[PDB]
Enzyme design. Structure first.
Site, PDB file in Angstrom:
ATOM      1  N   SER A 145       0.814  -1.228   0.000  1.00 53.31           N
ATOM      2  CA  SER A 145       0.000   0.000   0.000  1.00 53.31           C
ATOM      3  C   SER A 145       0.848   1.279   0.000  1.00 53.31           C
ATOM      4  O   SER A 145       1.634   1.483  -0.916  1.00 53.31           O
ATOM      5  CB  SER A 145      -1.054   0.016   1.111  1.00 53.31           C
ATOM      6  OG  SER A 145      -0.584  -0.611   2.286  1.00 53.31           O
ATOM      7  N   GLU A 239      -9.841  -5.017  -5.488  1.00 50.74           N
ATOM      8  CA  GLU A 239      -9.328  -3.818  -4.823  1.00 50.74           C
ATOM      9  C   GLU A 239      -9.718  -2.510  -5.479  1.00 50.74           C
ATOM     10  O   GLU A 239      -9.670  -2.377  -6.712  1.00 50.74           O
ATOM     11  CB  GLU A 239      -7.808  -3.884  -4.732  1.00 50.74           C
ATOM     12  CG  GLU A 239      -7.271  -4.917  -3.748  1.00 50.74           C
ATOM     13  CD  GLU A 239      -5.878  -4.558  -3.296  1.00 50.74           C
ATOM     14  OE1 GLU A 239      -5.740  -3.458  -2.722  1.00 50.74           O
ATOM     15  OE2 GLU A 239      -4.944  -5.361  -3.528  1.00 50.74           O
ATOM     16  N   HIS A 269      -7.140  -6.442  -0.278  1.00 47.53           N
ATOM     17  CA  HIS A 269      -5.938  -5.637  -0.042  1.00 47.53           C
ATOM     18  C   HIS A 269      -4.888  -6.370   0.797  1.00 47.53           C
ATOM     19  O   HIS A 269      -5.180  -6.825   1.902  1.00 47.53           O
ATOM     20  CB  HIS A 269      -6.349  -4.341   0.672  1.00 47.53           C
ATOM     21  CG  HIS A 269      -5.235  -3.357   0.841  1.00 47.53           C
ATOM     22  ND1 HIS A 269      -4.623  -2.741  -0.227  1.00 47.53           N
ATOM     23  CD2 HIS A 269      -4.619  -2.894   1.958  1.00 47.53           C
ATOM     24  CE1 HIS A 269      -3.673  -1.933   0.226  1.00 47.53           C
ATOM     25  NE2 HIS A 269      -3.649  -2.009   1.543  1.00 47.53           N
TER      26      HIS A 269
END
Length: 297
Positions: A145, A239, A269
Site C-alpha cells: 500500500s 481492490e 488488499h
C-alpha cells in the site's frame, strides 16, 4: 466474499476491523495491530531491533538466510498506521521464501511527521546498507500500500541523488495516487472490504500536511520513472487500488522499466498478510520469493 473457507475467514477478520468503532489515531494503530495479532511469529524466526542511520528498524530472518542479501521493506498503513508489529509475520514468510534477510523500517508516520519524511527515512536506511558493505545488486526494496508507493518514490529519489540503485522493487497493492482518481475506486467500491475512496483521501490529507497532493514523491503516478530496476507488482482483483497497480505498471513500462503485474482474482488488499491461514497468501509470497531469488540471489 468469494468462496473458500480460508478466504471467508480472512474477509471476516478484515470486515470486523473495518466495522470496529474508533476515535483516535492511536486507536486506529492499535486496531490494525489487533487484526493481525492472532498470527504469531514462527519459533525459528530471528529478529533484532536496531537503528539504521537514525531510523528504527528490525532484522527479520529464517534459518539458512543469506546475510548478504537484503529485502529493505516499507510497511503499509497510509503513512499513518502500521509497524513491524503488523508486518513482521508476513515479512518472515517472505524472508524464508526468498532465503534472504528482511530489514523492515519503522519509518516516521504522519500526522506527527508528514510527507516526505518516509522518503527521507528509506534513503537514510539504504545509505546505511551501502555504508555497511551491502552490495546494491544484492538489495531489493519492497512495500505494501503506502509502502508500495514509497518503494517507487524512494527508487526515484535515489536516482535523483545519484545513489547506485538496488536490484529490484516489489510493490504489493501500491498506493501511488494521493487523490484516489483510479476508476476502480468507483467500480470496486462495493467489492473491497477494507479500502475506500473516502478513507484514502482523509489519510492522504494527514500525510501531505498541506503539501501538493500531486507531488511526484507522494504520488509517483506523476514521478519520472526512468532508470528504475525491475519491478514486481501484485494486487487483488476486487481492490479499489487495482487501477493504482495498473497505472504504475503502465507508467513504468512506458519509461523503459521492466515491470510485471499480477492481478490475483478475489483477493483483498494485501492478502499476503494472511499467508499463515490463506493458501493464496502462501502462493503470492512464494512468487515474491522466486522474484527475489532471481534478482538478488
Amino acid at each position: 466474499m468469494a468462496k473458500s473457507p480460508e478466504l471467508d475467514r480472512v474477509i471476516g477478520m478484515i470486515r470486523e476491523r473495518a466495522a470496529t468503532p474508533r476515535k483516535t489515531t492511536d486507536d486506529d494503530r492499535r486496531l490494525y495491530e489487533t487484526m493481525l495479532g492472532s498470527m504469531p511469529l514462527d519459533d525459528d524466526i530471528q529478529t533484532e531491533r536496531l537503528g539504521v542511520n537514525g531510523v528504527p528498524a528490525e532484522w527479520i530472518y529464517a534459518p539458512g538466510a543469506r546475510d548478504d542479501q537484503v529485502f529493505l521493506y516499507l510497511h503499509g498503513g497510509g503513512y499513518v498506521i502500521g509497524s513491524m508489529r503488523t508486518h513482521r509475520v508476513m515479512l518472515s514468510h517472505i524472508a524464508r521464501a526468498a532465503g534472504c534477510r528482511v530489514l523492515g523500517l519503522d519509518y516516521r508516520l504522519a500526522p506527527e511527521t508528514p510527507f516526505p519524511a518516509p522518503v527521507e527515512d528509506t534513503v537514510a536506511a539504504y545509505r546505511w546498507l551501502l555504508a555497511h558493505g551491502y552490495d546494491p545488486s544484492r538489495i531489493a526494496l519492497g512495500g505494501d500500500s503506502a509502502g508500495g508507493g514509497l518503494v517507487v518514490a524512494a527508487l526515484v529519489a535515489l536516482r535523483y541523488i545519484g545513489e547506485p540503485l538496488p536490484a529490484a522493487g516489489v510493490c504489493l497493492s501500491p498506493w501511488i495516487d494521493m487523490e484516489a482518481t483510479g476508476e476502480s475506486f468507483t467500480t470496486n467500491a462495493t467489492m473491497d472490504p477494507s479500502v475506500n475512496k473516502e478513507r484514502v483521501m482523509s489519510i492522504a490529507a494527514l500525510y501531505l500536511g498541506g503539501k501538493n497532493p500531486q507531488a511526484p514523491l507522494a504520488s509517483p503516478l506523476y514521478a519520472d520513472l526512468q532508470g528504475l530496476p525491475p519491478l514486481l507488482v501484485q494486487v487483488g482483483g476486487i481492490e479499489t487500488l487495482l487501477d493504482d497497480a495498473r497505472a504504475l505498471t503502465t507508467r513504468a513500462k512506458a519509461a523503459g522499466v521492466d515491470a510485471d503485474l499480477e492481478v490475483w482474482d478475489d483477493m483483498p488488499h494485501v492478502w499476503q498478510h494472511f499467508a499463515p491461514i490463506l493458501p493464496e497468501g502462501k502462493q503470492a509470497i512464494a512468487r515474491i520469493g522466486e522474484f527475489l531469488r532471481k534478482q538478488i540471489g
